[PDB]
Structure formats: structure tokens, C-alpha cells
Design a protein around this ligand. Structure first.
Ligand SMILES: N[C@@H](CCC(=O)O)C(=O)O
Length: 277
């Protein structure tokens, strides 16, 4: 039975499960402009919600969706503003000190989005340039460290969410947008002129996405991991990948045209929660 102070206990006592979600993490957790929060990662959230309803024997359990940001996700998680979220949050050692993560659901490389006809081809070209990044992300940490350690004299602009960062680039307020490659492609898919943007540069890091939940809650993590494991090992995860990464997706019916890496296929065979950092 759920111990006091655990998430399942909180949900049962409050009579509702609070699902944190993203507004601009395409195509993981975002608004489809059809009144729904959708995406590859959100699909796991829905599966986890179903598992919770079953586990607690509450078929009519309330489900409340609350938007979160890269910057406020941990503080909101810690005071229980939301119970868990599946989106584009990187699982790393530092964050494990403040939260817990489910088995890995995606892997990304941190790169740059910039104009095709522009002069930015790699990270070295960013010296003395204006670069935008989303507040509270691993890319912001990496970019600031690179700026300091390599004395790049970059003017770093920190935006509230990925769409804001992209629009900063699109409107000429920055020459490049540094972020997880999948997210860069996601913002490009919503651009006024998608073809005008290229993802370039050597990845500054390889990062694993995991649904995030509160730390020291083994029972809720188990429920989430068990749900993820069945989705991945059954072949359902790949079907979700194809839907969100190989077919037209909202809100502009564009295609990500991504391919599932052999590494991801290996993980789907045997799910695990190892932080890549
Ligand atoms: N995955 C990175 C950037 C993307 C995001 O935060 O939504 C992070 O967790 O910081």
C-alpha cells in the first residue's frame, strides 16, 4: 500500500493526478492548436495516467494538466505543484539530487539552429555573436561554460521557452539557437519558412530524456518504469516514434523526417534509466 508522503498517496488523498506538460517541446509535449497537449512523450504520460487509475482502482480519477517550463519544473515538482511530467527533460546526475527519472524515452544531441544562407556552420563561428538559448536548460549551462572557458564573447539571450527562443532567431535578434537537436527540428517545423533553417555544429553533449517525478518515491517510479517497459518492449514505442517523427504532425502538418537510431532500438529492447551525463 502507498506509504504516506508518496505520490500515489498524494493522488489518492487529493482525488486527482496532476500531470505537468510542456507547451513548446515539439514533437514531445506541446500544444497542437486543436485544444490538446500532444506528443511522443505525452503518449507515455497518458499511459502512466491509465496505470495510475488501475493501480488505485479509481476509473474516474481526475486528471489535471499543468504547463511547466524548463526553468520552473524542479521547483514546481518539489512542492507538489505537479506529480510527474514526460516531455524533454534531461536526466543527469546533478538533477538526480533534486528529483528522480523514469527509464529513458529519447536521446538527443545539443546543436545549433541557424539560417541556411548565413555564415554559421559550426560552434567556432559563434565567437562574438548573439546566441539564444532557453532558460533553465542544459544547453544554457553548456553555452555559458563555453563562453567563459573558451572566451567566446557571445551575447547570450535567455528565452522562457523553445518557441520564444526560435522566434528570437527568426526575427534576427540572434544568429543561432542552441538546443537539443530534436527540439530544434520541432521548432523549425512550426517556422514561417522551415527550409530557411539548418541544424549545424558538433553536438556539445549527448543527453537522455526521462519522465521526471519526485525523488525517494520508488513505488511511483516503478509504476512509471513498468508502464514504459511494456510500451517499449512490445514495439508500441517505435509505433509512437513513427507517428511523431516520420509522419505529418501538427500544428502545420509538416514532417520531422527523423529516423530511430539503433541506440534507441536497443534501449526499447531492454529499458533502463541510466543518465548519459
Ligand atoms: N533536455 C534539456 C533541454 C530541453 C528542455 O529543457 O526542455 C534540458 O532538460 O535542460
Amino acid at each position: 500500500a502507498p506509504a504516506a508522503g508518496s505520490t500515489l498517496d498524494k493522488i489518492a488523498k487529493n482525488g486527482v493526478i496532476v500531470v505537468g506538460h510542456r507547451e513548446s517541446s515539439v514533437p514531445f509535449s506541446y500544444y497542437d492548436n486543436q485544444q490538446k497537449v500532444v506528443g511522443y512523450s505525452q503518449d507515455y504520460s497518458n499511459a502512466i495516467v491509465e496505470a495510475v487509475k488501475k493501480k488505485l482502482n479509481k476509473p474516474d480519477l481526475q486528471v489535471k494538466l499543468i504547463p511547466i517550463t524548463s526553468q520552473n519544473r524542479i521547483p514546481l515538482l518539489q512542492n507538489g505543484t505537479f506529480d510527474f511530467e514526460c516531455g524533454s527533460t534531461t536526466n543527469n546526475v546533478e538533477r538526480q539530487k533534486q528529483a528522480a527519472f523514469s527509464d529513458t524515452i529519447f536521446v538527443v544531441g545539443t546543436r545549433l539552429l541557424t539560417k541556411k544562407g548565413g555564415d554559421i556552420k559550426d560552434f567556432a563561428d559563434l565567437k562574438g555573436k548573439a546566441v539564444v538559448v532557453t532558460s533553465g536548460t542544459t544547453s544554457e549551462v553548456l553555452l555559458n561554460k563555453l563562453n567563459e572557458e573558451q572566451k567566446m564573447n557571445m551575447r547570450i539571450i535567455s528565452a522562457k521557452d523553445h518557441g520564444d527562443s526560435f522566434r528570437t532567431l527568426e526575427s534576427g535578434r540572434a544568429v543561432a539557437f542552441m538546443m537539443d537537436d530534436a527540439l530544434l527540428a520541432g521548432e523549425r517545423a512550426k517556422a514561417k519558412k522551415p527550409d530557411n533553417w539548418d541544424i549545424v555544429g558538433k553536438p556539445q553533449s549527448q543527453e537522455a530524456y526521462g519522465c521526471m517525478l519526485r525523488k525517494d518515491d520508488p513505488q511511483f517510479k516503478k509504476l512509471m518504469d513498468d508502464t514504459i517497459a511494456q510500451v517499449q518492449t512490445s514495439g508500441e514505442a517505435e509505433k509512437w516514434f513513427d507517428k511523431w517523427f516520420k509522419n505529418p504532425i501538427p500544428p502545420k502538418n509538416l514532417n520531422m523526417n527523423f529516423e530511430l537510431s539503433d541506440e534507441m532500438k536497443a534501449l526499447f529492447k531492454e529499458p533502463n534509466d541510466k543518465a548519459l551525463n
